[PDB]
Every structure is written in C-alpha cells, then in structure tokens.
Design an enzyme around this catalytic site. Structure first.
Site, PDB file in Angstrom:
ATOM      1  N   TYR A  55      17.941 -12.137  60.089  1.00  0.00           N
ATOM      2  CA  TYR A  55      18.785 -13.017  60.891  1.00  0.00           C
ATOM      3  C   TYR A  55      17.997 -13.641  62.038  1.00  0.00           C
ATOM      4  CZ  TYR A  55      22.411 -14.519  64.165  1.00  0.00           C
ATOM      5  OH  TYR A  55      23.186 -15.245  65.041  1.00  0.00           O
ATOM      6  N   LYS A  56      17.667 -12.826  63.036  1.00  0.00           N
ATOM      7  CA  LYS A  56      16.935 -13.306  64.197  1.00  0.00           C
ATOM      8  C   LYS A  56      15.467 -13.516  63.849  1.00  0.00           C
ATOM      9  CE  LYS A  56      18.358 -11.698  67.985  1.00  0.00           C
ATOM     10  NZ  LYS A  56      19.039 -12.988  68.281  1.00  0.00           N
ATOM     11  N   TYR A  57      14.848 -14.501  64.506  1.00  0.00           N
ATOM     12  CA  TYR A  57      13.448 -14.812  64.232  1.00  0.00           C
ATOM     13  C   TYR A  57      12.528 -13.657  64.603  1.00  0.00           C
ATOM     14  CZ  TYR A  57       8.947 -17.230  64.400  1.00  0.00           C
ATOM     15  OH  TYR A  57       7.635 -17.599  64.212  1.00  0.00           O
ATOM     16  N   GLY A  85      13.236 -10.516  64.417  1.00  0.00           N
ATOM     17  CA  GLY A  85      13.499  -9.320  63.642  1.00  0.00           C
ATOM     18  C   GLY A  85      12.453  -9.091  62.568  1.00  0.00           C
TER      19      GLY A  85
END
Ligand SMILES: O=P(O)(O)O[C@H]1[C@H](OP(=O)(O)O)[C@H](OP(=O)(O)O)[C@H](OP(=O)(O)O)[C@@H](OP(=O)(O)O)[C@H]1OP(=O)(O)O
Ligand SMILES: [Mg+2]
Ligand SMILES: [Mg+2]
Lengths: 359, 507, 151, 538
Positions: free
Chosen positions: B1-3, B5
């Site tokens: 999801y998050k860059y 992560g």
DNA sequence: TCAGAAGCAGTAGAGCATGCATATATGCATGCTCTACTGCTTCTGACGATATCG
DNA sequence: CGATATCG
C-alpha cells in the site's frame, strides 16, 4: 541549557565539551543531532569570549576545518549552513587575534553567499542561510570593520545587502532575516558613513514601518536600528554645514508631523522626542516657537488621555510613564514654561504616583 | 500500500526426527531441501529487493533462543535485511555433515507446542521498526498431523493461527515429502488461510511451490513512484494535475564504493578546489565560467548558464491535436513515459482526463504538447498518444489506462542519410525470402530476454561474497543459436544465395 | 498545555493523555478528553504500525470521548480498539503483555470532570496503592466532599 | 570535408520600406544571415564563407573595372567566419540608395567562387540569395549562368520576403495578400525557371521565405556532412549473411563545447586545480592515499571488494561486430511504447556491390508484405554491451532501408498497477462534457485536408523546427562577446513565436476553452509559485 | 567515434517540528530533512577502419 | 597482401 544556566562555572570541562561537539559534528550525519552540536559550541564561544580559555580551543584550526568544509562541492542542509556561517562570524569576534589573516577571506565568502541568496534569478532564496550570513556578518564586523572612508565598495555592498534584507518588498511570515538585518544595521551603522546619508528618506520610512510591527524581538531590533540611524544622521547633519538645508528641515518636518498628529501612540511620540533631541542638540537649531508648541501638544494629549478621560483605561496606565518621560524631556528644553500648564502637570504626576500599585 | 512499506518473510522449518530421516532412495532429506530452498530465496531476494526482511526459525529442537524464553524454539535469525553472512550461516547446515553440525549446535527430536511457535513468530513480527506491506510465514514441515494424540494443543494452535490471520499474517504451508502421505485436511486445513483446492487428496512428494522458490530470479524490483507531478495546461486557466510514470527504464549495475583495502570499510570522499599558486581554497562565488571561441573568451556567471536554458515553467502546455496516421514509428528519441491523473493537487482532474482519453481514443488523435520536466529546462514537443487498458488473464490489468508521452525529435536531431540508388528484387527472390522468413518466424515476449552483462555481474558478486571459487556462467539467452536455425530452414540458404549472389562472391 | 509524560510512577505500564515516545511500549491507553494538547502521538505512524501488529492493547475513554474521536477521519483507525467505560462504574482492566503471557489486573473508575464533552477522571487501584489523574478538571469549592467514588 | 558558401544579400532601398506592422525585409535577411553565421562560428566547423553586398552606395568588385557591376561590394572574402563578420552584420551594415540586380550579384558570386577556391579542396560549393525581386535586370546572361552552374557544380538557394496579422516565423502565410508587384511577379517566374533548370523539379522547393527560413534549418541543408557508416554483416543462420551499412538517423543533439572552470580574477583556467581527497570517517579524519583504495560493490547491506582487474578478467566477453536476426514476428505484438534507446539506426545495403542490395531489398519487401518485424542481436564492437531490437521495413519512393530501435530486457520492464478510469464512478464524465471535449478537439485540430484528395497536412511540423536552446545559447554568447558588461538579453520574438501553434487555432479554440472551463470544475489546493530571489529582493 | 562510466543536481513521499496568541487550545500551516531514483553533463578509453610501409 | 601506427 546547562551552559546557559551556569556560564562561567564550567571552567575545566569546556575543552572536553568542545571536543565532543567537534566529534559529533564530524562523525555524525543527521542534522537533528548536528544543529545542537554547533549551538553548544556557539554558546561556549559566547560565554568565554574574554576568558583565557580561548587558547586551548584552537580557534585557528577550528576556522580552518570549517572553511575547508565550506569549500566542498558536497552540499550540506540549509539549517546547518546557517549555524556554520554564524560560528564562522563569531570566530572573528571572540578571538580576533587569530583571525587577522582570515577576515579578508571570510568577508568575500559572506558577500558571495549573500549575493547568491539575494540576487538569484534562477532559484528561490534560502532564508536560513540568509539569517546565518547576516548574523555572521554582524559578528565579524565587530572587530574587522570596513567603513566608507576605508573602502567604499565593500562598505557599500554590505549596506545594500542590509537594505535588501530589511526591505519589505515581499511580505513574509518568518522574520528571522529582517530581524538579523535590523540587528546588523543597529550594531554597525557608524561604518556606512555616506550610505545612510543618501537613502535616508527610505531608511526612516522603513524603520518607522518596522518599529510598529506586532513582533517583540523585531520591534526591539527596529527600535535600536532607528536610534542608531538617528544618532548617526544627527551627528553628520550637525558636524557640517552642507547637510542642513535638506536633511535638517526634512527631519524636523517629520518629527513635527509625528508630534502634531492626533493618531500617534506613545511609541511614535517618544521616538520623535528622542530624534528632536539628538538633532537639535548639537545642531543648535532650537526655537522656542515650536518647542512650546510640542510641549502644549503633549500636555493637552496627556490631559485628554489620562485626566479628563475617566473610563476603563486598560492600556493607558501601562503607557503613562512613557508620556511622562517625553514630557520631562520636552520641558527640560524650553526656558519659558507656561504657568497655565503647571497644574495639569502637578496633578498628572500625582495621578501617575497614584497608579503605582497597578504595575 | 504505502510507498515506504516493505515485505517480511519468516522461514519456519521443523526439526523433528522425520525431518532428518526420510531418504527413501537417498536423494535429499527434508531438512536439507528446506535449507536449499531458504538459501535460494535469500539469494533471489538479496538482489531483487535488498530492503525486505527475512527470518529463519527452527522449532522442535532441544535448545532455545527466544525473547520470551519459550521451550524448544530457537530463533536463528531475526527479521532484518538479507546479507551474505546469513547465507553462510545457513550453509553451515546445508551439507550432509551440516546435519551433524546442526544436531550438535541446536539438537533435534524434541516435543513442542505449535501455539508457542506461532507466538514467537508474532513476537518477531512485532519487533520490526519499519512498515511491513506483507507478512508471510512459510512452514517447512513433513507432519500432516503434528499434534497427534492431543486435542488441547491442537485447539490452542488453531486459536493462535486464527489470531495471527486476524492480525494480517499470511500463513501458507510448504509441505515436504511424507513417507506415508501428507494430508492437510487433518490439521493444517484449519490453520492455513487459503486452500489451493487441489490437496483434497494426499501428497506423496514435495510441494509444487518449492520448485518455484528454487528458481533464483535476479532482477531488481522498484516500487511505483511518479517521476514528477506536473500540471497539464489545457489553457492559461484550465489546468489539471497529472503524474508522470516510467514503464520502461534502463537497468544499470550498482555503482562501486571506494574502500580502504585494510579494514574493508567505505571511505569519505571530499572533492575540493583551490588556487594552484596561492594554495587558498576557492568557493563557488569566487569562480566564473568561460568558453573560448577562437581568440575571444566569453565570461559568464554560474547562475547565467541556467538562464541560458530556461524558457517557461515546468508542466505540460497543451497544443493542438494530431492524428496518429502522421506519427512516424521511426521518429524515436527517448523512451516513452506514461501520463496518469493524480486528483491530489487540483480537484476534478480525473474526470477531464478520462473524457480526453475517451475522445482521443475514439478519434485516434494525439494531443501535442510542450514537455518541460524540471525548472530551467529547454522545452520539448511530445504527443500524448491515448492508451486504452487491456484486461486479460482472468481480468488482470496488463496495460494501464492513460496517455502515452512520446518524445518528438527536432530538426537537428534528425541526421542526414547519404544518397543511394534503390535496387529492387524479383518476385522469385522476394517469395524465397518470404518463405525463409516464415520458416524462422516465432512468437516474441518482452520478458523473454535477459541482460547478460548484468546477470554475469550478479553471479560474480555472489561468487565473491559467498567465497565460492566456481562462479556460475549465465547462459547467453540473446544468442541466435545458429546450430539449431539451420536445421529448420534446411537447404533454402544456398539456393537463395545462388539466386541473389554471383557465382563467386566474398561476403 | 499538558506537561504530563503520560506515565504514572506507580503504574508505568499504562500511559494517559500522551502516546509520543516511551508510551509505545504501554499495555493500555487512556484518554481523558478530546483536546489536542492531550492527544499527542495518538495519530503517530509508529502507533499506527503497532496497532496493526497487536490484539490486546486498547484505548479506554468516555463514550462521549469515543463519539467525538471516531467522528474525525484521521482517528477512525481506532474504531476497533476503543473500549468505552461508563462513569462511576469500577471496571477491571487486564494489562496482559503481548510478547509473554504475563498478565496484571487493575481497577479503574471514571469520574466526571466538568470541563468539556467527554472529560473524565481516572482513579486507579492496584498493587501499588490508589492513584488519581484529574486531567483538566473544574470543581467549585466544597464539591470534592460530594464525590461518592472518592469516599 | 570543407564546403564553400557565398552569402549574397541585397542592400537596396527596396527592402528598406517600413511596412506598418511588419519588419523590413532587410531586417529579416539580417536575422537569417546572423543565425547562419553564428551557427557556423559557434559550431567551430572547418569552413570558409564569403559575404557579397550588392545594391549599396559604394562599389568594390574585382570586375568593377569598365563601368560594370555597379553598387556591388564584396564585404567579406572566402575566409573562416569569426566575430568580425558578426560585428559587421550586427552594426556596420546600412541600407543603400541604389538598387542593383541579383543577376550581376550571381555573376560576381560565381567570380568569387571560381577565383578564390583555387588552392583549396572543397567538395561542396553553395550560393545563397536574399533579394526582393523588385529591381530591374536583364535577360541575356541567363544561359551563361546556367552553363557555369552546371559545369562548376554550384548549388543555389533563394530567400525572399514572401513565399511562393504577421508574426516572424509563426507558422503562417508570410506573403501579404496582393502585395506582389509585376516586377516581383516576373522575378518569381525567372527564379523558378532558373531553379528548375538546375536540378529538376525539386529545385523549385529550394525557395524559402524569410520567416520560413528562421524555423526550418533550410540554410544548412546543402552544407551538412553525412554520417559515418557502420560496416557489418546481417546474418540469418551460420552461413547466410548480407553485407550491410548502418547510419544513425535520429540522435539526441547536444552541445560540444563545455563550460570551462576559470578563476574569477584571472580568466585563465590554468590557475584552477581540482583535487580529490579520500579520508576515513573518524574523529581525526586520517587522510588516505589513492593507491590504497580497492573498488567494491554492495551486496545486501554488505560490501564485497571487487577490484578492477578482477572485474575485467571476469567480465562478460562477447564477439563484437555482430548483427544476427533472432527471428521474426508480427508487427502487432511489438509496440513502439517499449522502445528503449538513445539513437535510431537505418540499416542500408553494402557500399557498392549489388548482390547485398538485392538481398536486402528482397528482405525488406518480404517483411513488408507479411507485415512482420525482425528481432536482431546488435552489438557495436568488442566492448559494447549486446542488445536486442526491432528491425522493421521502411519503404519509400527513393530508397530502401531497415530501421533499428533497441528493445528492453527483462530487468527493464516495470509492472505498475494503476486504478481504472472506465468504471471510475467517482469521476465518470457526463455526456455534455463529452460533447464539449469533442468540440474542443475538433476546434484544436492541427491537421487539414486539402487538394480535394483529403490527405493529411499538419499545420505544426514540430519535426522540422530547430532546437531553440541552441539559438538562445548562440545569441547570448554573441551578446556577451560583443557587449562585455551587460545583462543577458531576453528571448527574441521569432524564437518564442516558432514554439507556438498558428494563431488561427487559438482564435478558433477561444470559445471551446471557455466552454470546457464552464462544465469542468477545477479547484486548486494551494498555489505556491516558486519565485526567484531577484523577484523578492530587487 | 562513440559507448559507458562518474559525478552531480532535482524531486517524490514520508515524516517531523514549531509557531500560532494573553488560548491553554490551537489543529493548523508551514517549512525542513532524508533517501532512492532519474537525468544531464563531462570524461575516458578501447577500438576498428583505414593509412602507411614491405 | 602484411601488418603497424594512426587518427576519429
Ligand atoms: O521534404 P518533404 O517533401 O517535406 O518530405 C520529407 C521527405 O519525404 P518525401 O520526399 O517522400 O516527401 C523525407 O525523406 P528523406 O529526404 O529523408 O529521404 C522524409 O524523411 P523520413 O522518411 O525519415 O521521415 C521526411 O522528412 P524528415 O527527414 O525531416 O522527417 C518528409 O517530411 P514530411 O513527411 O513532413 O513531408
Ligand atoms: Mg487539554
Ligand atoms: Mg482541557
């Protein structure tokens, strides 16, 4: 914080604190663990400026290290460059004996960085670097002065940079750069001899504009700069006879307009009285036909503000002492005191004494 | 999801007696096979994504090494970035004598509780100081019913597996070769998250995913990130925010690092310029830029060379539209980028983007623009070729929807071609060539070729890191294999030569 | 402002009105009311990452505080981890450790504060005696003798 | 490979007419000649040019003796261009009263070419003409000029104030409507005749306008040098091969002269020394030498020493000078959006032999008929890294060649997942918005159908405009070399006008732009324009 | 000649701090660092053709 | 044609 608390009490640990600060600055990379590493060193140098501990600090080697770091193509963050410039400027103030061979080189660095940050048409400026350069220049000019009667080019470009710094061309939200510029102008206004005597109109206008700012430190810096500017201009206009016909009448008209204005708080009145004093003192231009005028004006304003106006004066009491000081400064000048305004005065001082517990 | 992560993977290998004694025909023990698979995964991930987290935990042993001091659970490696030393530490147990080394270092053949193993795994997952995109635990065991003759431990393990799956931990099963037969329906059916729907019967050999994990795919993977957030300017007023993404980027080997040959540590490089005569250092403010033409010498400041190469603001100024029929395919200058709306700087950009995309797709027109990627950059002309998404392979997006930013060369980018005469060929010759081309035609896939230099560099780095003096030679997949092409065309080559070449000719 | 470090000296395993630096290791979170000075670190990325990796840590507060907190979109990730407690109702809180199966019971009581919607007090009773946390309260003279749960 | 070229500019009173709203043709010819001479000077290409000013007050010509060739002044002989010619063109060129003719100017240009290119070796000789065709001349010397041009191999180009509002080089009709006089008409007829009589029908296309010549790079068309051939063999199997030559057809054009680092006080570069020092990351910062540093890479948070000699001896070795077709596949399964490279290669046949030519032509025609491509394995030399790419046929009416563009490997492909827009219920546009966008697209069309055959004719040929950064750099260098202490001049108007579409498109799209503005709501979060330091501390 | 390799500069995306007034709450805005990635500019050297000598 | 040294 501890060095701020007990300044001179840390006699033996100063060398070890400096060594630890240098080691943290060298071996570490994070600016969050690097800004305090320079702030503590700046505090050390400012606390032990006159003490004999300035011999084991190795100011020469420290300056050489920081200058070699400046001459690196690898760029350091903006916040640490401000502290580096401030420290390099302070190095010439606390120990100028070991800076006689490096001040000429450091002035070129400061001027080049200021020109890059304030005369760039391809990139936005960097305000932290600007404030750092301004503080470094204000700390370096304390001993290695450069006056107009010594060298015109440098003393003129420094004055132009100070102008552009204190110039409210584009209104901003942070006031670090204009505060540093005002402090630099207040510290060394005695060097820009012919500079402030040419754009004195714009200088007085911008100083009156900054003295009424909402900030506190900026207000104090602007007040100090205005006082220094007024002192220097009064000296220059009272020493020679070719500055009277324009500057004398200009400043007298400005002061009279500030005084006779109905919407002018105690700050502008006090500034006008101090300027009139500093100017008409050495110039020997005092004329009773206007000193009595401003005296009656101040007395009537004080009477209508404090005596007759018997209402909720929430702020009037906190500014009555400034009115009293201005009234005394004016009364000491004129020799023919009007006897009709002696009661208003005695009762005014009585009512000021009565308001003492409210302070 | 998050860059920011990353991924996390915990290897869970059993150490029971069945793990060490399953050599039916003396081919590979389940423990050795698990070690080989773990080393393959480590090698394939240490180049692809060197920022992920890997951990190896053995349960059922005699000794124990945990943060909560649980019994018969030894955490060999915690969740950290994969390195070369961990590969060697796993190599310590790879060989046949590696089994004896393991049994002397950690032991084997002991009781355990599958709940405490999952608890240690969750504790390791809870000690990460970075954001984890995916959490996966691959269980390497050959026990179709581990908690036999006991229901309390089975229920406890089921509850703990349910808790882990509620936490968001992917729990798949890597079953090894069971002598009698591995049936997951007994116990592990209620433990794993998803069932492969094919193990309703029993297995007599290794799992089908082990051979997938044994194929070391070495290709650096990069997360999605826009190159720039520009602003498509349909006018001085109508402006929308779009993101520029690159779908084809040249792969480069990692740059070297200057080292100290004694301590093998990186050194700090500080370039510095000073006057050669006086010896004093020179700052950028004390330096000019010159360019000598003949006898003259033009002197320019540093900040003027940027004024030389600036025309407008960064963004995409929209010019008129052009049909695709006049866009020549041989007018290639730079690799094509990808335009996609952002809907984060301005509100209402995605709707106009989709409208423009549809209208340009049904009209096969290409919006010409003026591409300025960064500040103080000369402008380039690009055509926003519309691209429609293609949903294939049971609704898997292979092509994203949006515009195709194609660079257009200027007049001076096109070079001059020397004059030549058009000599043509006869229908017999063109038919022979058509036949010999149809004989050698094939199906092309964009991912069927590998960079041999990069793969060889990876193999050399592996050989120098693991201290193995036998560097693997990657077979060149770009070679035409002429030893097999001639066997397919047969005897068309010499006939075509005699048809189009003189009797005697030196090619 | 709140000069509290969200950590009582008697019970260091629970943090109140502060979740910034050392409270990431706490076993239970308490929120007096919904003022910003009492909500430092409540939306931190580290706390977000910890919540999705644990199952026994919760945030206790007043029901009105829960309603005011879940309305904000930035704090809606606490929807499954907030346990509201009625006022003047002594409840038992389990301070179970995540890593080890150790456990510790403590009795908390919520008392009205009269400050803002959802503002309550925290009265803890455990092995280390009784402690009271009156975060931003407002009591007139002669009202402390009227609190039933403090007698 | 030098090339002679003589610039023939008319300085008569005719071009000095101040037309309202349009610069004088003299000024446009000055702009064109300035651009030509500055690109010839700043490129530092070995070449010799000459300037012949005719129609001036004075008279200076080798054949001026005998009351012949009046008002002809050779202002510059065949010499290497330099800043002197730049200063001349910029400052000391003034209009003349008398109007000479372009025929005697062509005569004296031939004279200069044939009496100054004696001891030099010039493979190309060119003559450019900048006239208005509104002066009187004769009709006798035409055949002599034609014969001298056909026997001396002289190339000619003509530049006029009009083609065959008004913005200088703004992709529009340069000629004013009904502004051509009968003298100019007969001049056009005679110049078209003389251009056709030289090299055929294509000679008529060598007549450009003044505004047209500023954004087309046509003045450098007959002087640019050809590319370097890459001789290799196009193999199919182990025995079949074709002798081929490959040229770079498209390549990123960059500047060749770097910016030297010199001292601020002394403009000499020898006073600058760039020293690189390596040191450990310790407190004392011990200095490290250069011969005690070993190259090392990074392998999963570790550092593996990989020396240069070890990397060389273990490097991937390949047989250089290879070009082998890997196979064939349909052109529909290989898109241009995967092209990864920095240069385009056109694969031509061998130099002189005909067998390889026939073979390559057969290959091209076979690939065209089957609409398939040829995936090849290209490598420049022994050291270049091997690469694969497409080789598709390119058939034109004049030549045959194979275009080569490099293909990406497996490590060059990236699978980024983007949200869908077709089923984007949060952003699905309405039908009225679709009609508004349709009107905008139909209004902003840059192509038109003409000649009643309905063929495409783009109004904005961006593939023919020169790079504006080069012209900007040239004009700035010229301004700084001729004005030592002055700020950089702004971008000229013709450069800023050639980078814009025709004004008709904008005028027609004015209304659709507002229509798009009405329906589509665009709310901007926070606009913070990056203002430079000069704009804040002026 | 030109491919490839350093070397340097810019940005996205996350994250964090502080500055805000007479408020004890601001939440809110703003401005900075960090890191990995991409691109442009400058430099180098091997290399192959083709010039020259036998 | 050798094959050596340039020169780009
Ligand atoms: O000069 P134009 O009459 O305007 O046409 C030219 C010409 O093509 P044609 O002679 O068939 O019309 C070029 O052919 P060459 O001179 O290069 O052999 C061609 O080149 P390409 O095949 O490489 O595209 C391209 O000119 P350019 O090289 O500048 O692209 C094209 O231009 P148009 O298609 O716009 O007419
Ligand atoms: Mg509060
Ligand atoms: Mg409160």
């Amino acid at each position: 914080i501890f060095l701020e608390k007990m300044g001179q009490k840390i006699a033996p640990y100063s060398v070890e604190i400096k060594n630890t600060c240098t080691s943290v600055y060298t071996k570490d990379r994070a600016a969050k663990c690097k800004i305090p590493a320079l702030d503590l060193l700046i505090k050390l140098l400012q606390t032990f400026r006159s003490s004999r501990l300035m011999d084991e600090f190795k100011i020469g080697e420290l300056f050489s290290k920081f200058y070699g770091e400046l001459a690196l193509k690898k760029k350091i963050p903006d916040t640490v460059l401000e502290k580096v410039y401030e420290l390099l400027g302070l190095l010439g103030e606390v120990h100028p004996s070991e800076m006689i061979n490096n001040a000429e080189n450091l002035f070129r660095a400061f001027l080049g960085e200021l020109k890059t940050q304030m005369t760039s048409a391809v990139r936005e400026p960097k305000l932290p670097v600007l404030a750092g350069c301004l503080k470094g220049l204000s700390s370096l000019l304390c001993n290695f002065t450069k006056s107009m009667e010594e060298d015109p080019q440098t003393s003129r470009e420094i004055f132009n940079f100070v102008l552009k710094a204190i110039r409210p061309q584009i209104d901003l939200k942070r006031y670090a750069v204009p505060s540093a510029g005002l402090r630099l102008f207040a510290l060394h206004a005695s060097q820009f001899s012919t500079c402030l005597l040419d754009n004195y109109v714009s200088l007085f206008e911008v100083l009156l504009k900054w003295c009424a700012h909402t900030n506190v430190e900026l207000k104090k810096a602007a007040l100090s700069a205005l006082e220094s500017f007024l002192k220097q201009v009064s000296n220059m206009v009272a020493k020679n006879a070719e500055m009277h016909k324009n500057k004398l009448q200009y400043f007298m008209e400005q002061f009279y307009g500030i005084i006779r204005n109905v919407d002018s708080n105690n700050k502008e009145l006090s500034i006008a009285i101090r300027g009139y004093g500093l100017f008409a003192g050495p110039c020997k231009v005092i004329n009773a036909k206007d000193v009595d005028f401003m005296y009656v004006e101040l007395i009537q304003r004080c009477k209508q503000m404090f005596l007759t106006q018997t209402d909720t004066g929430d702020d009037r009491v906190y500014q009555m002492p400034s009115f009293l000081q201005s009234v005394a400064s004016v009364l000491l000048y004129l020799d023919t005191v009007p006897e009709v305004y002696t009661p208003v005065l005695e009762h005014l001082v009585v009512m000021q004494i009565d308001s003492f517990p409210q302070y | 999801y998050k860059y920011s992560g990353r991924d996390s993977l915990i290897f869970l290998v059993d150490a029971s007696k069945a793990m060490f004694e399953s050599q039916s025909e003396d081919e590979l023990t389940p423990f050795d096979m698990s070690i080989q698979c773990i080393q393959s995964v480590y090698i394939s991930k240490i180049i692809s994504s060197d920022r992920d987290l890997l951990a190896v935990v053995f349960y059922g042993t005699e000794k124990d090494k945990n943060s909560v001091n649980f019994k018969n659970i030894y955490v060999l490696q915690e969740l950290d970035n994969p390195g070369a030393k961990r590969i060697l530490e796993l190599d310590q147990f790879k060989g046949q004598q590696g089994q004896k080394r393991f049994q002397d270092m950690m032991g084997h053949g002991s009781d355990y509780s599958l709940s405490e193993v999952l608890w240690v795994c969750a504790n390791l997952f809870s000690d990460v100081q970075f954001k984890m995109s995916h959490k996966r635990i691959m269980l390497f065991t050959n026990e179709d019913n581990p908690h036999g003759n006991d229901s309390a431990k089975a229920s406890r393990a089921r509850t703990k597996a349910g808790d882990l799956r509620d936490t968001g931990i992917f729990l798949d099963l890597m079953h090894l070769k069971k002598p009698g037969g591995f049936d997951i329906s007994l116990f592990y059916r209620d433990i794993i998250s998803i069932a492969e729907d094919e193990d309703l019967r029993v297995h007599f050999e290794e799992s089908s995913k082990l051979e997938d994990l044994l194929r070391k795919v070495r290709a650096k993977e990069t997360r999605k990130r826009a190159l720039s957030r520009l602003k498509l300017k349909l006018n001085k007023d109508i402006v929308i925010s779009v993101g520029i993404y690159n779908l084809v980027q040249k792969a480069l080997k990692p740059p070297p690092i200057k080292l100290y040959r004694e301590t093998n540590e990186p050194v700090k490089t500080k370039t510095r310029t000073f006057n050669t005569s006086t010896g004093g250092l020179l700052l950028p403010s004390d330096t000019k830029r010159s360019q000598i033409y003949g006898s003259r010498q033009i002197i320019l400041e540093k900040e003027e060379t940027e004024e030389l190469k600036r025309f407008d603001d960064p963004g995409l100024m929209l010019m008129g539209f052009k049909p695709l029929v006049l866009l020549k395919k041989h007018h290639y200058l730079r690799p094509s980028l990808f335009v996609y709306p952002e809907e984060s700087l301005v509100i209402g950009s995605s709707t106009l983007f989709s409208a423009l995309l549809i209208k340009c797709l049904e009209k096969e027109v290409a919006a010409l623009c003026r591409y300025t990627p960064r500040r103080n950059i000369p402008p380039y002309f690009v055509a926003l070729v519309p691209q429609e998404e293609e949903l294939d392979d049971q609704k898997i997006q292979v092509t994203p929807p949006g515009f195709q930013l194609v660079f257009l060369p200027f007049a001076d980018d096109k070079r001059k071609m020397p004059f030549t005469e058009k000599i043509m060929a006869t229908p017999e010759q063109v038919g022979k060539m058509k036949a010999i081309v149809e004989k050698l035609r094939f199906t092309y896939r964009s991912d069927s070729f590998e960079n041999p230099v990069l793969q060889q560099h990876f193999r050399n780095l592996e050989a120098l890191a693991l201290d193995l003096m036998e560097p693997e030679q990657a077979v060149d997949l770009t070679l035409p294999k002429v030893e097999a092409m001639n066997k397919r065309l047969g005897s068309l080559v010499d006939e075509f030569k005699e048809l189009v070449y003189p009797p005697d000719y030196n090619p | 402002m709140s000069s509290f470090e969200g950590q009582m000296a008697e019970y260091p395993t629970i943090s109140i009105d502060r979740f910034d630096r050392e409270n990431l290791r706490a076993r239970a979170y308490f929120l007096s009311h919904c003022h910003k000075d009492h909500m430092k670190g409540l939306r931190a990325p580290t706390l977000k990452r910890r919540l999705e990796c644990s199952l026994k840590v919760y945030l206790y507060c007043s029901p009105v505080t829960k309603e005011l907190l879940l309305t904000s979109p930035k704090y809606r990730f606490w929807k499954k981890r907030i346990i509201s407690i009625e006022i003047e109702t002594p409840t038992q809180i389990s301070l179970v450790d995540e890593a080890s199966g150790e456990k510790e019971e403590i009795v908390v009581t919520l008392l009205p504060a009269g400050h803002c919607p959802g503002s309550v007090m925290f009265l803890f009773q455990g092995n280390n005696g009784t402690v009271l946390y009156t975060g931003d309260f407002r009591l007139a003279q002669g009202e402390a003798a009227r609190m039933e749960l403090l007698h | 490979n030098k090339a002679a070229v003589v610039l023939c500019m008319d300085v008569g009173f005719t071009m000095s007419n101040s037309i309202p709203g349009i610069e004088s043709p003299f000024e446009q010819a000055k702009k064109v000649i300035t651009m030509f001479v500055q690109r010839q000077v700043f490129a530092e290409n070995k070449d010799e040019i000459a300037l012949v000013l005719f129609g001036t007050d004075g008279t200076d010509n080798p054949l001026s003796g005998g009351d012949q060739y009046q008002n002809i002044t050779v202002h510059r002989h065949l010499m290497l261009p330099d800043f002197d010619l730049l200063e001349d063109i910029e400052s000391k060129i003034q209009p003349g009263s008398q109007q000479a003719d372009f025929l005697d100017a062509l005569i004296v240009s031939m004279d200069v070419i044939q009496h100054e290119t004696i001891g030099k070796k010039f493979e190309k000789r060119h003559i450019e003409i900048f006239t208005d065709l509104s002066s009187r001349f004769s009709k006798s010397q035409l055949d002599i000029i034609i014969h001298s041009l056909k026997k001396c191999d002289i190339s000619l180009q003509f530049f006029l104030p009009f083609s065959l509002p008004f913005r200088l080089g703004g992709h529009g009709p340069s000629f004013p409507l009904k502004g051509i006089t009968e003298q100019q008409k007969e001049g056009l007829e005679i110049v078209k005749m003389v251009m056709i009589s030289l090299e055929g029908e294509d000679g008529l296309d060598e007549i450009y306008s003044f505004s047209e010549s500023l954004r087309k790079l046509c003045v450098f068309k007959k002087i640019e040098r050809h590319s370097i051939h890459w001789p290799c063999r196009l193999t199919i199997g182990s025995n079949l091969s074709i002798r081929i030559a490959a040229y770079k057809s498209i390549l990123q054009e960059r500047v060749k002269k770097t910016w030297t680092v010199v001292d601020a006080k002394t403009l000499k570069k020898e006073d600058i020394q760039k020293e690189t020092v390596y040191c450990l990351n310790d407190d004392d910062e011990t200095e490290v030498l250069k011969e005690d540093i070993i190259q090392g890479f990074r392998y999963g948070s570790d550092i593996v020493p990989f020396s240069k000699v070890d990397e060389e001896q273990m490097k991937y070795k390949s047989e250089g000078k290879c070009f082998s077709v890997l196979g064939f596949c349909k052109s529909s399964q290989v898109q241009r959006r995967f092209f990864m490279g920095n240069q385009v290669l056109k694969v031509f046949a061998a130099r002189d032999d005909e067998a390889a030519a026939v073979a390559l032509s057969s290959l091209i025609h076979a690939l065209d008929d089957l609409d398939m491509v040829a995936i090849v394995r290209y490598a420049y030399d022994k050291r270049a890294n091997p690469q694969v790419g497409v080789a598709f046929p390119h058939i034109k009416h004049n030549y045959e060649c194979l275009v080569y563009v490099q293909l990406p490997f497996m490590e060059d492909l990236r699978q980024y997942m983007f949200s869908s827009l077709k089923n984007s219920k949060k952003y699905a546009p309405t039908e009225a918005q679709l009609n508004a966008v349709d009107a905008l697209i139909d209004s902003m069309s840059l192509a038109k159908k003409d000649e009643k055959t309905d063929t495409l004719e783009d109004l904005f040929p961006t593939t023919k405009i020169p790079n504006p950064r080069f012209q900007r750099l040239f004009q700035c260098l010229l301004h700084r070399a001729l004005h030592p202490r002055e700020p950089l001049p702004p971008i000229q108007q013709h450069i800023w006008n050639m980078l814009n579409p025709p004004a008709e498109v904008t005028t027609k799209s004015q209304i659709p732009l507002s229509k798009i503005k009405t329906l589509f709501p665009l709310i901007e979060a926070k606009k913070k324009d990056q203002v430079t330091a000069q704009e804040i501390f002026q």
